[PDB]
Structure 1
Amino acid sequence: GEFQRKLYKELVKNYNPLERPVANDSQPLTVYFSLSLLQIMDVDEKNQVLTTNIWLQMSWTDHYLQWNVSEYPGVKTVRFPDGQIWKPDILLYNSADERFDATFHTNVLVNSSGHCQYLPPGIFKSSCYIDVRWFPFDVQHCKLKFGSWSYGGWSLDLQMQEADISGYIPNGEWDLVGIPGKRSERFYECCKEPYPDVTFTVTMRRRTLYYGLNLLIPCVLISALALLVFLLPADSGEKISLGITVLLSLTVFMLLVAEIMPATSDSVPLIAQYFASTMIIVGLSVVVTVIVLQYHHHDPDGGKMPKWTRVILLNWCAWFLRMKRDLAKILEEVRYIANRFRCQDESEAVCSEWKFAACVVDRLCLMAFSVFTIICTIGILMSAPNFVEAVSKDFA
């Protein structure tokens, strides 16, 4: 229309985009900064970066962009693109990405009385600190530091508005708790400029259904089969075969885990200790099995038990586990044959109790290793704080 064309001509008349729109060059310009979280794109522990899709709202007041409604009746608001009107230089301080702005400058709405609002969308990649302790059951606090880069305390008075979460599109992996904020001003090394800033911190809780079922559940089941060695009879030459196959089949899990675990020397993660515990329990099973096996094939008539094994593994431990354990030359020739058989029976009896001792050790170690696994798995998981709420929410 003729009024819109006319109004745009006075508005850009003698206008300098490099100038603060303050009427008096002695008072700071009040700028209201807010934030709207639309979704959490991804949280990557390896690079310790946080990708979020958010909206920004910068609102200030202009003095030269004012006009009377009566003179121009039809038009009420005007829009100016980037590079034609003064805008605040508020930007993310972290900005862990190649290009540092990440704001996608759009049109800037202008009031009928000079109140200018700016609503740019962008995808931000901030530098967060992923404290990976109690990894499946961890809560992360990520900060977003926003503030002006060239305007100090007396030039741009940065104010704060509460963050908006109307429309969040939940990720499904991380459960958002809340996004509080804070406004403060600090003194930097360069200058005597007190620089205000707005720091929005994001608190999110990691869901545990995927990690618990795909990682924690198989570990208990695989470790259970390593406990099944003591139930196999020693006759079947198969004890070490299943003893070492489970160990080989269980080292593969940290290969997946280490691909996700950041290589940070802050603290030993809970998942790292739990896997390490399974290494030792399965590893010590093979060592015990070797001791059991040599008790079976002891090659008798080559050394008797030192009389401590006859009383420990056959009287004390056994009670606990309810084991309950021309004719003259013809005669001489037959004499040797029967005596040889008699000596074979004596050797068999000596070897028989050697095998029974191995059975006692196997059964004794089964009870000892079983209670170790029960308290090791439970004890580590119980130690994690807020473990109960995650189970009560994700699982139950």
Structure 2
Amino acid sequence: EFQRKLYKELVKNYNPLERPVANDSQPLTVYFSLSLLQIMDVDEKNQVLTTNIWLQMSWTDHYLQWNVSEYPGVKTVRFPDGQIWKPDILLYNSADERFDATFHTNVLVNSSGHCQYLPPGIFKSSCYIDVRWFPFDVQHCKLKFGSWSYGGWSLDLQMQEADISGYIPNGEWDLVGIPGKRSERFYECCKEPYPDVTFTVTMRRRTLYYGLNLLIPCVLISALALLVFLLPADSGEKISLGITVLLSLTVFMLLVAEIMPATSDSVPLIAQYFASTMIIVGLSVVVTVIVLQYHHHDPDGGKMPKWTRVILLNWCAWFLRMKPDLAKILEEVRYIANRFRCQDESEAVCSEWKFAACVVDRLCLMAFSVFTIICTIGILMSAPNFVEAVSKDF
């Protein structure tokens, strides 16, 4: 009854097109804040951030006032979209197909005219994602809010500190903070400020998933490629091991494909590490082929060069600490024995080529193990957030 009288009275001559100020020259203050509930997606390719956010707007409507003694029990009235005036505050850098992601709830007003509008939404904002340091990257995503048509002398947009009391932690990203900043804009025509409120969402990528599902499968496969150097050449499986390890890494590259970004703004750190892994495993297969040329060298081919003999068999091998009728019977038997002697001389030349190949294996083992470690620790710890990341995620 009092409620029914009040609602009928409040809408009389009310124009939702009117900015509700007692003085049309003076400004209308709007307090803008938001409440971040979730970070939903950080899409690299589309360059979009998806968040669950409750916007908070407060302002005063000069016309929606009543004395509560004259309307006992009626302390607040609600109005649905299109019935009272509302600030046209929109997310400027919206990437949503609708552009306005808000669900238009009721606007709460008390007897003094204080309006409270709490539109929820699943916002999509345009954000430049820098994947240079991926997986250890850190993003700074701006959420720029302002009025679509009212300058600062009409809609004076003020800012209130963002709320994160109901924030759900994500499993992919840390929330560092969501500071806001009210900034004015100026047109050369005029002196009027044009305010906006930008909340910069700062978020750190969690790296436990990437450590356990990429580095460990990648380091382990990268270590098996070095295992070729410990495998004898007589196993007949040195190429089998190395080329199948490369094949495994080709198969693993498909998993890496899905998660990897797809940009040309930089080479991601993760792409450097996996790219390097490929080269080291590819070169291991190369030196394996060179080793087998030594191991299977023809005994009746080119004599071991002096420099080959000097470098491998002496210096490197020291550094590595390796190291009537009866007369014709005499003729035939001697032929058999001297043939065994030639066979043994060729076997000894072959043994020297085989030891040269063992020495090249030990050198390739050391060289590749060192290169592997220095490329792993160097690429990974290059990231400015590496130590922090491992400290918080492991």
Q: Deviations over 1:8-32 (max 9, x none)?
A: 1211111111111111111111111
**How many pairs were matched up?**
394
Contact 1:35/1:55 (8 A) holds in 2: yes
Cα deviation, 1:222-254, whole Å, max 9, x if unaligned, reads: 111000001111111111111100011102333
For 2:329 and 2:260, the matched residues in 1 are separated by: 82
8 A Cα contact 2:151 2:193, kept in partner? yes
Deviation at 1:194, TM superposition (A): 3.7
Report deviation, 1:325.
46
Alpha carbons of 1:43 and 1:19: their partners in 2 closer, same or farther (altered >3 Å)? same
Map of 2:98 onto structure 1: 99
> Structure 1, unaligned stretches of length 5 or more?
none
How far did residue 203 of structure 1 move? 0.7
Q: In the alignment, is the contact (CA less than 8 A) between 2:44 and 2:262 conserved in 1?
A: no
Deviation at 1:296, TM superposition (A): 1.1
Cα deviation, 1:69-89, whole Å, max 9, x if unaligned, reads 221122111111111111110
Deviation at 1:94, TM superposition (A): 1.4
**Deviation string, structure 1 residues 104-140 (Cα, Å, up to 9, x no partner):** 1111111111111111111101111110011011111
Shift of 1:261: 2.6
State how far apart, in whole Å, the 2-side matches of 1:196 and 1:381 are. 42
Partner SS for 1:146: strand
Cα offset for 1:328? 2.4
CA distance in 2, matches of 1:245, 1:144: 49
Residues 325 and 356 of structure 1 are in contact (CA less than 8 Å); yes or no, is this contact kept in structure 2? Answer: no
TM-score normalised according to structure 2 size: 0.96
Distance 2:123 2:112 in 1: 33
Pair 1:237–1:189, CA change in 2 (3 A): farther
Structure 1 Cα separation of the partners of residues 269 and 21 of structure 2: 56
CA distance in structure 2 between the partners assigned to 1:287 and 1:159 by the alignment: 66
CA separation of 1:131 and 1:15: change in aligned 2, threshold 3 A = same
Q: Which residue number in structure 1 is paired with residue 261 of structure 2? A: 262
Distance 1:192 1:260 in 2: 49
Secondary structure, in 3 states, of the residue corresponding to 2:233?
coil
Give the whole-Å Cα distance in 1 for the aligned partners of 2:197 and 2:324: 78
Q: In 2, Cα distance between the equivalents of 1:178 and 1:385?
A: 19
Q: Pick closer, same or farther for the CA change 1:169–1:340 going to 2, 3 Å.
A: same
Give the unaligned 5+ runs of structure 2. none
Distance 1:51 1:191 in 2: 36
Hey, what's the Cα distance between the residues in 2 that align with 1:172 and 1:337?
Answer: 78
Answer yes or no: is the 8 Å Cα contact 2:29–2:59 preserved in 1: yes
- Decide whether aligned partners of structure 1 residues 333 and 325 sit closer, same or farther in structure 2, where only a CA change above 3 A counts: closer
The alpha carbon displacement at 1:189 in A equals 8.7
- Kindly indicate whether the alpha-carbon contact (under 8 Å) linking 1:295 and 1:357 is maintained by their aligned counterparts in 2: yes
Q: Percent identity?
A: 100
Most deviating of 300-309 and 286-295: 300-309
**Counterpart Cα distance in 2 of 1:251 and 1:372:** 21
- Residue number in structure 2 paired with 1:24: 23
Report if the CA contact (8 A) 1:92-1:144 is conserved: yes
Indicate if the aligned counterparts of 2:53 and 2:121 stay in contact, CA closer than 8 A: yes
Deviation at 1:192, TM superposition (A): 7.5
Pair 1:227–1:392, CA change in 2 (3 A): same
Q: CA deviation at 1:191?
A: 8.2
Distance 1:94 1:345, change over 3 A: same
Contact 1:16 1:85 in 2 (8 A): yes
Contact 1:67 1:113 in 2 (8 A): yes
Distance 1:325 1:318, change over 3 A: farther
Alignment root-mean-square deviation, CA: 2.8
Contact 1:141 1:204 in 2 (8 A): yes
Q: Distance in 1 between matches of 2:282 and 2:190?
A: 61
Q: 1:284-334, CA deviations, whole angstroms, 9 ceiling, x for partnerless residues?
A: 101101111011111112221122222221111111112229322232222
Q: Is the 8 A contact 1:88 1:148 kept in 2?
A: yes
| Distance (whole Å) between structure 2 residues aligned to residue 334 and residue 171 of structure 1 | 87
Q: Which moved more, 1:329-338 or 1:86-95?
A: 329-338
Please report how far the alpha carbon of residue 146 of structure 1 lies from its aligned counterpart in structure 2 after TM superposition: 0.5
- CA 191–385 in structure 1, closer or farther in 2 if over 3 Å, else same: same
Q: Which moved more, 1:18-27 or 1:63-72?
A: 63-72
Inter-partner Cα distance in structure 2 for 1:303 and 1:159: 87
1:44 Cα deviation from its structure 2 partner: 1.6
Q: 1:97 to 1:325 in 2, by over 3 A?
A: farther
Farther-moved stretch of structure 1 (246-255 vs 127-136):
246-255
Check conservation: 1:11, 1:64, Cα contact below 8 A. Answer: yes
Comparing 250-259 and 49-58, the one that deviates more = 250-259
**Deviation digits for residues 34-63 of structure 1, max 9, x if unmatched?**
111111122222212111111111111111
CA contact (8 A) 2:37 2:52 kept: yes
Does the aligned pair in 2 maintain the 1:143–1:202 contact within 8 Å? yes
181-190 vs 109-118, which moves further: 181-190
Structure 2 CA distance for aligned equivalents of residues 172 and 314 of structure 1: 57
1:193 CA drift (Å): 5.9
Aligned residues of 1:21 and 1:64 also touching (Cα < 8 A): yes
Q: Distance in 2 between matches of 1:190 and 1:255?
A: 56
Report if the CA contact (8 A) 1:89-1:150 is conserved: yes
Q: For the residues of structure 1 that align with 2:309 and 2:391, how far apart are their CA atoms?
A: 52
Say whether the 8 Å CA contact 1:45–1:260 is kept in structure 2.
Answer: no
Contact 1:46-1:260 at 8 Å conserved across structures: no
Between stretches 44-53 and 286-295, larger displacement belongs to 44-53
Cα distance change of structure 1 residues 168 and 102 upon mapping to structure 2, 3 Å threshold: same
Q: 1:1-396 to 2 correspondence within 5 Å?
A: 2-187=1-186, 194-324=193-323, 326-395=325-394
Is the 2:312–2:356 contact (alpha carbons within 8 Å) kept by the matching residues of 1?
yes
Summarize deviations over 1:326-383 as a string: whole Å, max 9, x none. Answer: 3222322223222222222222211111111111111111111111111111111111
Contact 2:224 2:245 (C-alpha < 8 Å) held by counterparts:
yes
Render the CA deviation track for 1:261-296: whole Å, top value 9, x for unaligned.
Answer: 332221111001101111111011011011110111
